[PDB]
């Protein structure tokens, strides 16, 4: 198991990434603000916290060259929607573009509530 420390990671970040790896999401999450941008890992986590995910609304990791950014945006919007309503998380001033753009404050606001759940 990967127990290394990065050059610039806090214990909170390391715990989040460690549970990412331990929970068994299909991608090996190395950077929180670099692997969640497609929201595919977040949707997987939603399944692990017993929040249902309709993958027919989820754009698969093989994105077409045309519109891949839009497909990822749609995935982030769906992830935010699943985090607000059925997951019951406090996400004031958070939108799908924030996860798409990797806003650390709003992303941590979601992953710590994922820890809590």
């Amino acid at each position: 198991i990967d127990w290394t420390l990065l050059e610039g990671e806090t214990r909170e970040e390391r715990t989040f990434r460690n549970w990412m790896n331990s929970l068994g999401v299909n991608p090996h999450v190395n950077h929180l603000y670099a692997d969640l941008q497609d929201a595919l890992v977040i949707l997987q986590l939603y399944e692990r916290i017993k929040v249902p995910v309709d993958w027919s609304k989820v754009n698969k990791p093989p994105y077409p060259k045309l519109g891949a950014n839009m497909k990822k945006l749609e995935n982030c919007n769906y992830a935010v929607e699943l985090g607000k309503h059925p997951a019951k998380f406090s996400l004031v001033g958070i939108g799908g573009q924030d996860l798409n753009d990797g806003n650390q404050t709003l992303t941590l606001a979601l992953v710590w509530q994922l820890m809590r759940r």
């Binding site: 839009m70 749609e74 004031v92 001033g93 799908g96 573009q97 924030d98 709003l106």
Partner: peptide
């Protein structure tokens, strides 16, 4: 502070955020 959009959204998916609060505002 609290920030709210003042212009027309024209690209789909990007308009889903109604409020901005911290430094993002």
């Amino acid at each position: 502070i609290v920030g709210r959009p003042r212009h027309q959204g024209v690209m789909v998916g990007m308009g889903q955020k109604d409020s901005y609060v911290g430094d993002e505002a």
